[PDB]
Design a protein around this nucleic acid. Structure first.
Length: 103
DNA sequence: TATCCTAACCAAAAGATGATTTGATTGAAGGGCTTAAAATAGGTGTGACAGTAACCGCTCGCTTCGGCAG
């Protein structure tokens, strides 16, 4: 069960380029997405679809507190709560204006 | 420079503008009436009739069962 049997990618390979030596339909669709975004009018490193989630994940994921009293108990429940804003679009119903709080 | 404004333009939220599709309304017609009359021909149930029926504060008079009489 060693990883040499599974690691088609070497540890020194960047994720910014699609490996052409693949048979994946997913990577084919990814190539279709990337090819039409390489022109001077379309090439950029802007937001993909959203930014907030990773920014507030990496800012806190895997970190530990500076005080002992602020320690999460082992096995403590983590609850994800979405709080909607008072200013609703009142034009769309699929998506909502909300902020997600972890308690 | 690190960073920004926001003229003119690109990506996305929202904010809006007219053409088209679907939920909803209805105009007209199938239909099935009305009393008004005049008429012969009719069937019986039923609803009066009638009957029994039943159910639903003070002061006198009168009486008895023993304690001596005979």
């Amino acid at each position: 069960c060693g990883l040499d049997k599974l690691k088609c990618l070497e540890d020194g390979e960047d994720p910014e380029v699609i490996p052409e030596n693949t048979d994946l339909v997913t990577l084919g669709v990814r190539k279709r997405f990337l090819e039409h975004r390489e022109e001077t009018i379309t090439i950029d490193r802007a937001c993909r679809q959203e930014t907030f989630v990773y920014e507030m994940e990496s800012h806190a994921i895997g970190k530990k507190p500076e005080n002992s009293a602020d320690m999460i108990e082992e096995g403590e429940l983590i609850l994800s709560v979405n709080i909607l804003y008072p200013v609703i679009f009142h034009k769309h119903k699929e998506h909502k204006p909300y902020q997600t709080m972890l308690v």
